[PDB]
Write an enzyme that holds these catalytic residues in place. Structure first.
Site, PDB file in Angstrom:
ATOM      1  N   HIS A 319      -2.224   6.039   5.146  1.00  0.00           N
ATOM      2  CA  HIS A 319      -2.146   7.331   4.514  1.00  0.00           C
ATOM      3  C   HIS A 319      -3.372   8.174   4.699  1.00  0.00           C
ATOM      4  O   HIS A 319      -4.411   7.668   5.050  1.00  0.00           O
ATOM      5  CB  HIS A 319      -1.703   7.236   3.047  1.00  0.00           C
ATOM      6  CG  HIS A 319      -2.707   6.657   2.083  1.00  0.00           C
ATOM      7  ND1 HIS A 319      -3.504   7.437   1.273  1.00  0.00           N
ATOM      8  CD2 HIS A 319      -2.989   5.373   1.755  1.00  0.00           C
ATOM      9  CE1 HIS A 319      -4.253   6.659   0.514  1.00  0.00           C
ATOM     10  NE2 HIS A 319      -3.964   5.406   0.782  1.00  0.00           N
ATOM     11  N   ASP A 329     -10.773   4.550   0.039  1.00  0.00           N
ATOM     12  CA  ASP A 329      -9.299   4.595  -0.012  1.00  0.00           C
ATOM     13  C   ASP A 329      -8.882   6.040   0.170  1.00  0.00           C
ATOM     14  O   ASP A 329      -9.128   6.841  -0.728  1.00  0.00           O
ATOM     15  CB  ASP A 329      -8.838   4.053  -1.382  1.00  0.00           C
ATOM     16  CG  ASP A 329      -7.356   4.246  -1.641  1.00  0.00           C
ATOM     17  OD1 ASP A 329      -6.557   4.329  -0.661  1.00  0.00           O
ATOM     18  OD2 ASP A 329      -6.975   4.304  -2.847  1.00  0.00           O
ATOM     19  N   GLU A 366       0.478   9.394  -0.412  1.00  0.00           N
ATOM     20  CA  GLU A 366       0.587   7.984  -0.842  1.00  0.00           C
ATOM     21  C   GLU A 366       0.249   7.813  -2.297  1.00  0.00           C
ATOM     22  O   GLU A 366       0.959   7.149  -3.024  1.00  0.00           O
ATOM     23  CB  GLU A 366      -0.364   7.098  -0.081  1.00  0.00           C
ATOM     24  CG  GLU A 366      -0.081   5.615  -0.219  1.00  0.00           C
ATOM     25  CD  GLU A 366      -0.950   4.912  -1.236  1.00  0.00           C
ATOM     26  OE1 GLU A 366      -2.040   5.356  -1.597  1.00  0.00           O
ATOM     27  OE2 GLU A 366      -0.548   3.861  -1.693  1.00  0.00           O
ATOM     28  N   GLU A 375      10.002   9.354   2.439  1.00  0.00           N
ATOM     29  CA  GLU A 375      10.907  10.403   2.861  1.00  0.00           C
ATOM     30  C   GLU A 375      11.138  10.315   4.352  1.00  0.00           C
ATOM     31  O   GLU A 375      12.231  10.561   4.816  1.00  0.00           O
ATOM     32  CB  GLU A 375      10.328  11.743   2.506  1.00  0.00           C
ATOM     33  CG  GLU A 375      10.108  11.887   1.060  1.00  0.00           C
ATOM     34  CD  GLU A 375      11.409  11.892   0.321  1.00  0.00           C
ATOM     35  OE1 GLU A 375      12.364  12.580   0.744  1.00  0.00           O
ATOM     36  OE2 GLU A 375      11.499  11.199  -0.704  1.00  0.00           O
ATOM     37  N   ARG A 476      -0.098  -6.563   6.681  1.00  0.00           N
ATOM     38  CA  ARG A 476      -1.343  -5.841   6.484  1.00  0.00           C
ATOM     39  C   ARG A 476      -2.546  -6.747   6.478  1.00  0.00           C
ATOM     40  O   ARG A 476      -2.403  -7.943   6.227  1.00  0.00           O
ATOM     41  CB  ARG A 476      -1.293  -5.113   5.163  1.00  0.00           C
ATOM     42  CG  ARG A 476      -1.377  -6.036   4.006  1.00  0.00           C
ATOM     43  CD  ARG A 476      -0.617  -5.439   2.866  1.00  0.00           C
ATOM     44  NE  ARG A 476      -1.223  -4.213   2.328  1.00  0.00           N
ATOM     45  CZ  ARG A 476      -1.520  -4.044   1.045  1.00  0.00           C
ATOM     46  NH1 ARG A 476      -1.286  -5.006   0.170  1.00  0.00           N
ATOM     47  NH2 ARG A 476      -2.038  -2.907   0.645  1.00  0.00           N
ATOM     48  N   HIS A 490     -10.685   5.003  -6.626  1.00  0.00           N
ATOM     49  CA  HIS A 490     -10.025   6.199  -7.115  1.00  0.00           C
ATOM     50  C   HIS A 490     -10.917   7.010  -8.034  1.00  0.00           C
ATOM     51  O   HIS A 490     -10.429   7.512  -9.044  1.00  0.00           O
ATOM     52  CB  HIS A 490      -8.744   5.858  -7.864  1.00  0.00           C
ATOM     53  CG  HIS A 490      -7.594   5.533  -6.966  1.00  0.00           C
ATOM     54  ND1 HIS A 490      -6.314   5.365  -7.432  1.00  0.00           N
ATOM     55  CD2 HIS A 490      -7.542   5.320  -5.627  1.00  0.00           C
ATOM     56  CE1 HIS A 490      -5.519   5.077  -6.418  1.00  0.00           C
ATOM     57  NE2 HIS A 490      -6.238   5.035  -5.315  1.00  0.00           N
ATOM     58  N   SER A 565      23.592 -25.156 -11.227  1.00  0.00           N
ATOM     59  CA  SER A 565      23.248 -25.982 -10.099  1.00  0.00           C
ATOM     60  C   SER A 565      22.563 -25.247  -8.942  1.00  0.00           C
ATOM     61  O   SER A 565      23.074 -24.253  -8.443  1.00  0.00           O
ATOM     62  CB  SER A 565      24.495 -26.683  -9.604  1.00  0.00           C
ATOM     63  OG  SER A 565      24.208 -27.459  -8.443  1.00  0.00           O
ATOM     64  N   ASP A 603      16.424  -9.646  19.953  1.00  0.00           N
ATOM     65  CA  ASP A 603      17.272  -8.993  18.987  1.00  0.00           C
ATOM     66  C   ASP A 603      17.462 -10.005  17.875  1.00  0.00           C
ATOM     67  O   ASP A 603      17.225  -9.693  16.737  1.00  0.00           O
ATOM     68  CB  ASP A 603      18.593  -8.529  19.623  1.00  0.00           C
ATOM     69  CG  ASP A 603      18.489  -7.165  20.267  1.00  0.00           C
ATOM     70  OD1 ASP A 603      17.387  -6.609  20.346  1.00  0.00           O
ATOM     71  OD2 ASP A 603      19.515  -6.626  20.714  1.00  0.00           O
ATOM     72  N   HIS A 626      15.541  -6.521  -0.222  1.00  0.00           N
ATOM     73  CA  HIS A 626      15.180  -7.858   0.244  1.00  0.00           C
ATOM     74  C   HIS A 626      15.468  -8.894  -0.838  1.00  0.00           C
ATOM     75  O   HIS A 626      15.046  -8.761  -1.982  1.00  0.00           O
ATOM     76  CB  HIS A 626      13.697  -7.938   0.627  1.00  0.00           C
ATOM     77  CG  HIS A 626      13.394  -8.929   1.694  1.00  0.00           C
ATOM     78  ND1 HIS A 626      13.483 -10.291   1.489  1.00  0.00           N
ATOM     79  CD2 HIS A 626      13.016  -8.765   2.982  1.00  0.00           C
ATOM     80  CE1 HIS A 626      13.165 -10.919   2.603  1.00  0.00           C
ATOM     81  NE2 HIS A 626      12.872 -10.026   3.520  1.00  0.00           N
ATOM     82  N   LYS A 636       3.735  -4.306  -9.946  1.00  0.00           N
ATOM     83  CA  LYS A 636       4.314  -3.853  -8.698  1.00  0.00           C
ATOM     84  C   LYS A 636       3.395  -4.202  -7.513  1.00  0.00           C
ATOM     85  O   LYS A 636       3.830  -4.272  -6.356  1.00  0.00           O
ATOM     86  CB  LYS A 636       4.560  -2.358  -8.850  1.00  0.00           C
ATOM     87  CG  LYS A 636       4.613  -1.592  -7.624  1.00  0.00           C
ATOM     88  CD  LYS A 636       4.872  -0.135  -7.933  1.00  0.00           C
ATOM     89  CE  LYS A 636       5.570   0.582  -6.790  1.00  0.00           C
ATOM     90  NZ  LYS A 636       5.760   1.964  -7.194  1.00  0.00           N
ATOM     91  N   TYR A 637       2.126  -4.443  -7.798  1.00  0.00           N
ATOM     92  CA  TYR A 637       1.160  -4.765  -6.788  1.00  0.00           C
ATOM     93  C   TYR A 637       1.430  -6.158  -6.234  1.00  0.00           C
ATOM     94  O   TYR A 637       1.115  -6.451  -5.120  1.00  0.00           O
ATOM     95  CB  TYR A 637      -0.217  -4.714  -7.426  1.00  0.00           C
ATOM     96  CG  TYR A 637      -0.821  -3.321  -7.563  1.00  0.00           C
ATOM     97  CD1 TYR A 637      -0.418  -2.287  -6.737  1.00  0.00           C
ATOM     98  CD2 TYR A 637      -1.817  -3.043  -8.532  1.00  0.00           C
ATOM     99  CE1 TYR A 637      -0.985  -1.006  -6.868  1.00  0.00           C
ATOM    100  CE2 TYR A 637      -2.382  -1.781  -8.673  1.00  0.00           C
ATOM    101  CZ  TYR A 637      -1.961  -0.785  -7.824  1.00  0.00           C
ATOM    102  OH  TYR A 637      -2.475   0.469  -7.922  1.00  0.00           O
TER     103      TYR A 637
HETATM  104  N1  QUS Z   1      -1.450   2.871  -3.847  1.00  0.00           N
HETATM  105  C1  QUS Z   1      -1.458   3.951  -4.847  1.00  0.00           C
HETATM  106  C2  QUS Z   1      -0.059   4.563  -4.848  1.00  0.00           C
HETATM  107  N2  QUS Z   1       0.929   3.801  -5.607  1.00  0.00           N
HETATM  108  O1  QUS Z   1       1.396   2.560  -5.048  1.00  0.00           O
HETATM  109  C3  QUS Z   1       2.679   2.412  -5.472  1.00  0.00           C
HETATM  110  O2  QUS Z   1       3.342   1.422  -5.200  1.00  0.00           O
HETATM  111  N3  QUS Z   1       3.005   3.491  -6.184  1.00  0.00           N
HETATM  112  C4  QUS Z   1       2.001   4.338  -6.262  1.00  0.00           C
HETATM  113  O3  QUS Z   1       1.932   5.377  -6.825  1.00  0.00           O
HETATM  114  C5  QUS Z   1      -1.971   3.400  -6.142  1.00  0.00           C
HETATM  115  O4  QUS Z   1      -1.972   2.152  -6.261  1.00  0.00           O
HETATM  116  O5  QUS Z   1      -2.387   4.201  -7.002  1.00  0.00           O
HETATM  117 CA    CA Z   2      13.771  11.476  -0.862  1.00  0.00          CA
HETATM  118 CL    CL Z   3      -3.271  -2.001   4.057  1.00  0.00          CL
HETATM  119 ZN    ZN Z   4      -5.271   5.021  -3.425  1.00  0.00          ZN
HETATM  120 ZN    ZN Z   5      -4.598   4.329  -0.501  1.00  0.00          ZN
END
Ligand code: QUS
Ligand code: CA
Ligand code: CL
Ligand code: ZN
Ligand code: ZN
Ligand SMILES: *[C@@H]1O[C@H](CO)[C@@H](O[C@@H]2O[C@H](CO)[C@@H](O[C@@H]3O[C@H](CO)[C@@H](O)[C@H](O[C@H]4O[C@H](CO)[C@@H](O)[C@H](O)[C@@H]4O)[C@@H]3O)[C@H](O)[C@H]2NC(C)=O)[C@H](O)[C@H]1NC(C)=O
Ligand SMILES: *[C@@H]1O[C@H](CO)[C@@H](O[C@@H]2O[C@H](CO)[C@@H](O[C@@H]3O[C@H](CO)[C@@H](O)[C@H](O[C@H]4O[C@H](CO)[C@@H](O)[C@H](O)[C@@H]4O)[C@@H]3O)[C@H](O)[C@H]2NC(C)=O)[C@H](O)[C@H]1NC(C)=O
Ligand SMILES: *[C@@H]1O[C@H](CO)[C@@H](O[C@@H]2O[C@H](CO)[C@@H](O)[C@H](O)[C@H]2NC(C)=O)[C@H](O)[C@H]1NC(C)=O
Ligand SMILES: *[C@@H]1O[C@H](CO)[C@@H](O[C@@H]2O[C@H](CO)[C@@H](O)[C@H](O)[C@H]2NC(C)=O)[C@H](O)[C@H]1NC(C)=O
Ligand SMILES: *[C@@H]1O[C@H](CO)[C@@H](O[C@@H]2O[C@H](CO)[C@@H](O)[C@H](O)[C@H]2NC(C)=O)[C@H](O)[C@H]1NC(C)=O
Ligand SMILES: *[C@@H]1O[C@H](CO)[C@@H](O[C@@H]2O[C@H](CO)[C@@H](O)[C@H](O)[C@H]2NC(C)=O)[C@H](O)[C@H]1NC(C)=O
Ligand SMILES: *[C@@H]1O[C@H](CO)[C@@H](O[C@@H]2O[C@H](CO)[C@@H](O)[C@H](O)[C@H]2NC(C)=O)[C@H](O)[C@H]1NC(C)=O
Ligand SMILES: *[C@@H]1O[C@H](CO)[C@@H](O[C@@H]2O[C@H](CO)[C@@H](O)[C@H](O)[C@H]2NC(C)=O)[C@H](O)[C@H]1NC(C)=O
Ligand code: NAG
Ligand code: NAG
Ligand code: NAG
Ligand code: NAG
Ligand code: NAG
Ligand code: NAG
Ligand code: QUS
Ligand code: CA
Ligand code: CL
Ligand code: ZN
Ligand code: ZN
Lengths: 687, 687
Positions: A319, A329, A366, A375, A476, A490, A565, A603, A626, A636-637
């Site tokens: 990004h 970052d 990002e 998108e 990654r 940040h 089971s 393939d 998935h 979510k991380y």
């Molecule tokens: N990497 C960024 C962006 N971010 O990552 C997501 O999965 N959503 C989201 O807003 C963060 O961690 O702040």
């Molecule tokens: Ca969209």
């Molecule tokens: Cl990365």
């Molecule tokens: Zn960031």
């Molecule tokens: Zn970032």
């Protein structure tokens, strides 16, 4: 050849680029960013790519009202505002200049100004709330939660607090988590000052991209939903502070003791859960006036065409937008991409071409929910799933200088071990030894024995659409410290200086990451047979099947009452192992001269990851498809395996209707089972 | 070569097979059918296929309780049962024998025994109900609907009546629709006797397959839903009758006149809408006691491996199960498949092989909701979408003897015109002329000028999963009469005799269909470049864009009030045209010697249909994902174009909240638009 590719990458150039990329702030949706996009476009053209496009979208962003500042007050008996929180961070030395740096804020907070009684909740992780409300039996409803950055994605805490009836959320960064002992604050060390504040977005998009157009690209004609049905908007306001202001809110804290030392940072205070103040008497008031608004954003896409298989896509992406200067970052990743592109464009110029087509994206937006890359996937999804070989991500390259850190799909473990074995470690004290060597030494896998750890894939960065929705093999790599992040993450202090002085003066860690990254691209893009080992998958799949099985056994009473089971999963998993053996045997034995038979196998290799996708998606999260991995529903991380089943098993004792719950665990199992088998048979003989 | 393939197909053999296939009844789930499956397996092996598999599933079927018969009574003041309906059809001459023929019934009716007042409703099409309730203002709630077979899929009528509060449904076949004037009843002509009764299922599965396992195969471990959440079960009982009993229920009919002559069959009665009887006084009572039960079913799959591209699947498929003997439906198709397989296995034996892999399925349980073929797709969906070149269907071959009838995807129009031009018409009076010629002469396209009509694809037979959910290019062909069906359709009278004597004594119509069918397989399986013309799509797409546009203009007041614009669709559609020109240009110009470039283009051709699929599906019907075509929501037998938009436009004046409605029309438009464009760009250069 590869040796050539690498030799051409120069640390000096990376420094050059990172310096260039971080002189001014680069917020999504601002002109500075549009201009950098315009730039990357030309130099990419110049470095010799065949085509470099801008792709633009009109998506929902979020900003602070410039003329009407967000802040926290304390308020006496007749709302005298006694105390207020910062309105900006003290800028680093040499950026009064800093013409306009966005003030701290949590992106997409609803507007509001609520009052009530702090309740402290620690990290605002699921269990803290469990601890609070199941033990302490302290009740969050009606209150304002203050919690501390660290541990899990900030969007998770705000969702949690919301669940728990809260009416506001304040995040802060506690020196407990952002203060490495014995190192000094910026500008002099790399610890976070008590003035600075972790920016970041708080949406729970769960994979949808721009919140107004889940499923389709946000192009010119795209129909958009009401902000009222937007995907993943919180409905309680949120705001972040440094630990100075923190202290001032934490210091008067009423109700109980922290239920234990795990709940206590290094601020000199009681860390009292609450609610109330001790000042009984005084109350908290938030002032959030940010606005959300559809804004245009710009992705940069550069094609380097294949010579043999122009219809196979290898993609390197990262990004471009930053919260402030973004010295770490994203621009430490971006810089690396740049030197990588230039290096390819170089061989290209010498008259060389890759076997497959390579794609290079600078992603936009990002920081606001993985919007930029998403998108684009939504727009090109058809071309991506019938052609996407693999995606490598390129956000920050270093976040520490102690060892390598890789997350990827099992189908890349082999290539990643081979490749790191062919590269020099740049660690103080392993001059002479290989990068496989240092990395293995410093970071050894739980899964055993003589093996570097490699992690699962959750979400939390731009690879998410590509792996979790589309099923394109992803990975990654970056240098790490010995989820919370690094202290100055940040914040205004992430600057070019931050890197030159403290992280990687030499630029040798950058250039190692530049090699792992460009090296993986290179192999994947050029090697006659794809670098995937379907067998490694057959490995981890059986481990995962064990893990989930162990979990369920915490409840054998039920497991018996309902005939729960796992035979189907194990059966499926065994079959996988077997078929992949046979498959790779065949992969050994077949004249590489026969192109049609070649293409046919690659393939099979290519579409194999694609086989773990369910078109119906996991329950409640349609854009997470998935079956093997999804983002943790609690963080979510963090990636989790057999998410469908784990999530059904999770906190199951608390459910009213145990027969319905256990029934759904079973359903979940039977979907895993079939999907592992179904995948397997893609590897079977095609007729 | 093709000439060889054809010459090898013999009418005599077809007669042989059809005779063999229809001596006993062959109901899904019965041993007779398991045994025929066992048979097709060997002769397919014998005819020389490389592998012939059984694939079995355990799905929900439905039967009449043998010891406790379904029927309709009329009932006096104290429920004396005055009149009862047949309990079986008079068997044709020479099948007292007929050891056990299932009695008529509507499959999957809920159990029940309701009473109330006939209301007549004509075909139970949407508009009839409109006519009834918007004009007549006659109210169906609380009543029992009797309606007449014909016009639309029987599952549609039962859904309609249900919507309209009905508490029972009786279907009958009116000589109006099943009695060709001047022809005599079976055994002596082919008109339906007043004794016989169209069998058939009434589910609204809307694409899900076995109602208990939507989304996944119904294999051994498959978790199954409660019959209470089964997909598409009616909740009011249904039952069918011949026109003798019909008359007896129709004859006392109270309330209004038929609102017009369109509402009146050739039974000598008033055709009075109702409700009530004139007998005021007397009432109707249904007796439905069928049971639903998970039963095992058997598909036959035979691979004929490709020599060049073993990983491309061409599929010829048709169903094997019948309601009774099935002399026409399905065994006239089945017979044709058989002669086709044998003919391939013949060249194969002479040492020949197709360029691609061909698959031959005898499907099971078609009559109960396309269950047999569906579960198979659900199981192999991954292999099908990355490899499925095209699917040709093979149910009944003749249903009439007047001309050819083809439905298919635009990408087959060219191949179908070329192929029919290379075949002799077998029409009385076109000896000497081509099949393109007779067919064009007898059946000329609305769309103009010198062009045989070809129809869209709805649902209503086994191709549905393959086109509508998966996006594999599909088509079908058979001989037709000059939706209602043929008179003796799904009744005891469909026998081998029915065909030999009245339809095709010569077996020349069978063998023409055997040529169109095997001929299309042959081309698709063997031709160096795929027979698809992406341009024909570019044609029909613009026609369809016009059609839908015209519809909307019925409401320009609104269209203005809400800025309803089709520019995006037209724009998208123009782009398609353009890209396909350019594409086919390129298709002309490229050394067929380069295999990799070949494979790359055929992939573009192959995946093109796949491009019209939305993973999210159309609204409310998740397993209908083609954006261009789906089954009509008013008649599943009929295909409709831009279903997403048509359906939103449909009956829009009646909606409360016109802003929300018109908003959704727009959404729908913008999804069409993007999907046509997105498809188009698959045809663009790949880098
Ligand atoms: N990497 C960024 C962006 N971010 O990552 C997501 O999965 N959503 C989201 O807003 C963060 O961690 O702040
Ligand atoms: Ca969209
Ligand atoms: Cl990365
Ligand atoms: Zn960031
Ligand atoms: Zn970032
Ligand atoms: C892993 O790969 C193996 C293939 O090597 C695969 O093996 C299959 O197991 C299935 C699943 O059970 C076997 O199922 C049987 O099929 C026979 C017909 O060949 C039936 O008669 C059996 O049904 C009878 O008994 C049932 C089960 O107890 C009763 O419910 C039923 O009423 C019948 O009376 C049964 O369906 C199948 O034969 C094999 N195929 C083989 C061995 O090649 C296995 O399933 C794969 N695993 C997964 C999870 O997909
Ligand atoms: C069919 O194919 C053609 C390609 O030949 C394709 O053309 C594209 O049309 C888009 C859609 O409108 C054009 O969009 C513009 O892009 C420029 C930048 O290059 C922008 O400045 C424009 O935005 C300004 O004006 C907008 C529109 O009025 C304002 O809303 C906005 O605020 C801006 O000030 C606009 O976005 C695009 O340039 C072309 N690409 C081309 C011409 O190559 C067309 O869209 C395809 N059709 C479909 C339905 O997909
Ligand atoms: C960063 O690097 C770029 C590329 O060299 C510099 O862009 C060039 O600088 C001047 C503008 O003063 C122009 O003559 C060239 O057009 C620019 N090239 C572009 C826009 O690609 C850029 O100005 C440097 N910026 C910083 C902040 O150091
Ligand atoms: C915190 O900042 C607030 C908000 O501006 C200050 O309170 C304001 O003071 C102005 C100027 O006198 C008043 O006229 C406004 O009524 C106030 N706004 C509100 C809502 O109170 C206040 O001075 C600050 N408190 C401290 C410790 O400086
Ligand atoms: C990583 O390296 C190992 C060894 O280099 C590779 O597996 C070998 O590949 C050779 C070349 O085909 C085989 O004949 C040997 O049988 C393999 N040795 C082993 C232990 O398998 C593997 O290909 C490499 N992984 C990659 C490059 O993806
Ligand atoms: C229809 O045709 C088949 C194939 O010739 C007949 O099956 C053979 O007939 C006898 C059984 O009487 C056996 O010797 C062979 O095993 C059968 N072959 C099979 C089962 O594939 C079948 O019996 C004929 N049936 C009818 C109803 O005419
Ligand atoms: C229609 O069939 C019904 C159902 O069997 C007949 O009514 C039954 O007659 C038996 C034998 O006498 C009675 O004992 C049962 O009570 C009846 N069942 C019911 C629900 O009524 C009846 O005879 C028939 N009507 C005609 C015209 O033959
Ligand atoms: C149907 O036939 C027409 C004419 O046979 C085919 O289009 C021709 O194909 C030749 C061979 O490539 C081309 O050079 C000519 O330009 C074409 N004539 C026309 C009018 O296009 C078309 O290929 C055939 N459709 C098929 C076989 O799919
Ligand atoms: C910023 O502040 C003013 C008034 O203090 C508000 O009315 C204006 O609309 C705001 N701009 C926004 C909401 O973007
Ligand atoms: C929490 O407290 C509030 C009282 O304001 C109440 O309305 C809610 O039901 C409470 N529930 C719990 C979790 O104790
Ligand atoms: C880089 O150099 C040394 C080596 O361990 C380390 O102590 C220092 O903290 C490193 N950079 C950062 C900021 O962690
Ligand atoms: C068939 O009829 C009997 C009684 O007349 C019923 O009890 C039996 O269970 C039925 N069998 C079913 C429902 O399949
Ligand atoms: C139809 O009639 C019944 C009365 O039994 C009633 O309950 C229902 O509301 C009626 N509605 C219409 C469509 O007139
Ligand atoms: C077949 O032969 C003649 C030709 O028109 C036709 O009248 C007869 O009805 C045909 N078969 C059927 C059953 O339609
Ligand atoms: N072709 C059969 C089967 N049938 O077709 C469907 O689409 N559903 C269904 O049950 C019939 O028309 O009775
Ligand atoms: Ca199913
Ligand atoms: Cl058909
Ligand atoms: Zn049929
Ligand atoms: Zn049928």
């Amino acid at each position: 050849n590869m040796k050539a590719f690498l030799d051409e990458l120069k640390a000096e150039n990376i420094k050059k680029f990172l310096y260039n990329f971080t002189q001014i702030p680069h917020l999504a949706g601002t002109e500075q960013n549009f201009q950098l996009a315009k730039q990357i476009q030309s130099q990419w053209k110049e470095f010799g790519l065949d085509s470099v496009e801008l792709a633009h979208y009109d998506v929902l962003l979020s900003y602070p009202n410039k003329t009407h500042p967000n802040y926290i007050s304390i308020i006496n008996e007749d709302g005298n505002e006694i105390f207020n929180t910062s309105l900006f961070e003290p800028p680093p030395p040499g950026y009064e200049n800093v013409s306009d740096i966005v003030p701290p804020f949590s992106a997409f907070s609803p507007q509001g100004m609520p009052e009530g009684d702090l309740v402290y909740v620690n990290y605002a992780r699921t269990e803290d709330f469990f601890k609070l409300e199941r033990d302490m039996k302290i009740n969050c409803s009606g209150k304002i939660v203050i919690a501390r950055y660290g541990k899990v994605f900030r969007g998770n805490k705000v969702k949690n607090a919301q669940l728990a009836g809260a009416k506001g959320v304040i995040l802060y960064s506690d020196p407990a988590d952002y203060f490495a002992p014995g190192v000094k604050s910026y500008p002099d060390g790399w610890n976070l000052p008590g003035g600075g504040v972790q920016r970041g977005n708080i949406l729970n998009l769960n994979g949808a991209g721009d919140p107004l157009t889940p499923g389709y690209p946000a192009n010119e004609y795209a129909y958009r939903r009401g902000i009222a049905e937007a995907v993943g908007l919180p409905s309680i306001p949120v705001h972040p502070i440094g630990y100075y202001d923190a202290q001032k809110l934490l210091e008067k804290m009423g109700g109980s003791a922290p239920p234990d030392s795990s709940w206590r940072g290094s601020l000199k205070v009681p860390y009292n859960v609450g609610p109330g103040f001790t000042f009984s008497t005084q109350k908290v008031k938030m002032h959030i006036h940010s606005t959300n608004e559809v804004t245009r954003i710009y992705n940069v896409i550069g094609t380097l065409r294949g010579a043999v298989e122009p219809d196979r896509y290898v993609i390197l992406g990262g990004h471009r937008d930053s919260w402030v200067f973004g010295g770490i970052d994203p621009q430490s990743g971006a810089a690396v991409v740049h030197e990588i592109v230039r290096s390819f464009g170089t061989l290209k110029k010498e008259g060389w071409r890759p076997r497959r087509t390579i794609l290079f994206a600078s992603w936009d937006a990002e920081e606001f929910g993985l919007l930029g890359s998403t998108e684009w996937a939504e727009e090109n999804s058809r071309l991506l799933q019938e052609r996407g070989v693999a995606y490598i991500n390129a956000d920050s390259s270093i976040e520490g200088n102690y060892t390598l850190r890789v997350d990827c799909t099992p189908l890349m473990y082999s290539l990643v071990h081979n490749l790191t074995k062919e590269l020099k470690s740049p660690d103080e004290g392993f001059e002479g030894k290989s990068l496989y060597e240092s990395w293995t030494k410093k970071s050894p896998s739980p899964e055993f024995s003589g093996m570097p750890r490699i992690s699962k894939l959750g979400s939390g960065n731009d690879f998410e659409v590509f792996f979790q929705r589309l099923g394109i093999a992803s990975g990654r790599a970056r240098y790490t410290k010995n989820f919370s992040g690094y202290p100055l993450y940040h914040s205004v202090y992430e600057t070019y200086e931050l890197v030159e002085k403290f992280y990687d003066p030499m630029f040798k860690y950058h250039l190692t990451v530049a090699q792992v990254r460009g090296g993986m691209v290179f192999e994947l893009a050029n090697s006659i047979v794809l670098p995937f080992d379907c067998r490694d998958y057959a490995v981890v799949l059986r481990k995962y099947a064990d893990k989930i099985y162990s979990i369920s056994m915490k409840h054998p009473q039920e497991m018996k009452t309902y005939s729960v089971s796992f035979d189907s999963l194990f059966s499926a998993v065994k079959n996988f192992t077997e078929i992949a053996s046979k498959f790779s045997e065949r992969l050994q034995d077949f004249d590489k001269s026969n192109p049609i038979v070649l293409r046919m196998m690659n393939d099979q290799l290519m579409f194999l990851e694609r086989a773990f996708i369910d078109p119906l998606g996991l329950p409640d999260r349609p854009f997470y498809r998935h079956v093997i991995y999804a983002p943790s529903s609690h963080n979510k991380y963090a990636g989790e395996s057999f998410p469908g089943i784990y999530d059904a098993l999770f906190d199951i004792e608390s459910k009213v209707d145990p027969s319905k719950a256990w029934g759904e665990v079973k359903r979940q199992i039977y979907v895993a089972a079939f999907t592992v088998q179904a995948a397997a048979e893609t590897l079977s003989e095609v007729a």
